[PDB]
Amino acid sequence: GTSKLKYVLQDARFFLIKSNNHENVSLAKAKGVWSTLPVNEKKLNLAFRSARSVILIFSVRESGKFQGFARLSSESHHGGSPIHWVLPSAKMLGGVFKIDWICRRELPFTKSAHLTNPWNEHKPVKIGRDGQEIELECGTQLCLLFPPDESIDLYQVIHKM
Ligand SMILES: CNC(=O)c1cccc2[nH]ccc12
Numbered sequence: 001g002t003s004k005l006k007y008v009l010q011d012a013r014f015f016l017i018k019s020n021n022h023e024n025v026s027l028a029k030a031k032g033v034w035s036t037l038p039v040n041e042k043k044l045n046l047a048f049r050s051a052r053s054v055i056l057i058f059s060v061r062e063s064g065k066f067q068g069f070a071r072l073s074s075e076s077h078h079g080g081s082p083i084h085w086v087l088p089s090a091k092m093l094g095g096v097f098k099i100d101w102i103c104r105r106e107l108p109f110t111k112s113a114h115l116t117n118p119w120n121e122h123k124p125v126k127i128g129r130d131g132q133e134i135e136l137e138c139g140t141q142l143c144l145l146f147p148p149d150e151s152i153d154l155y156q157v158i159h160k161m
Pocket residue numbers: 019020024034035036037085086087088130
């Protein structure tokens with residue numbers, strides 16, 4: 001069904017996360033973690049305190065698709081085990097956010113062409129810098145476009161809200 005998904009997304013905030021490669025998204029899916037540059041780390045930490053759910057929607061640059069979406073389960077922290085990200089230095093990154101995946105399935109950009117993001121000049125929602133916020137209605141509809149991910153049980157995520 002889609003009812004628990006809709007509940008998780010109610011009054012959520014949404015951020016576009018652009019990865020330079022598939023390896024980092026694979027690491028994020030396997031380990032439930034993300035790290036971004038401090039400019040975006042500060043925005044995500046502010047959002048985490050401000051809303052019931054903060055949703056990261058992932059797209060690997062040049063792939064023509066989104067690779068899934070996840071919900072922040074924590075503000076960023078430092079001092080964990082070093083994550084072997086593939087970078088173009090690791091010190092340049094901010095802290096590490098724990099995330100709970102909501103959907104690990106892909107969605108091609110051709111399927112989101114009817115969705116524009118008011119917070120990026122009403123450009124198609126696929127267009128945006130890493131960290132671009134997606135307005136609530138556009139973000140909800142985008143997440144609802146993804147194929148259902150039957151491996152996921154949102155019961156435990158609902159309890160974190
Ligand atoms: C896992 N985090 C990243 O891959 C990342 C996040 C934000 C800016 C970035 N610039 C180069 C890599 C990168």
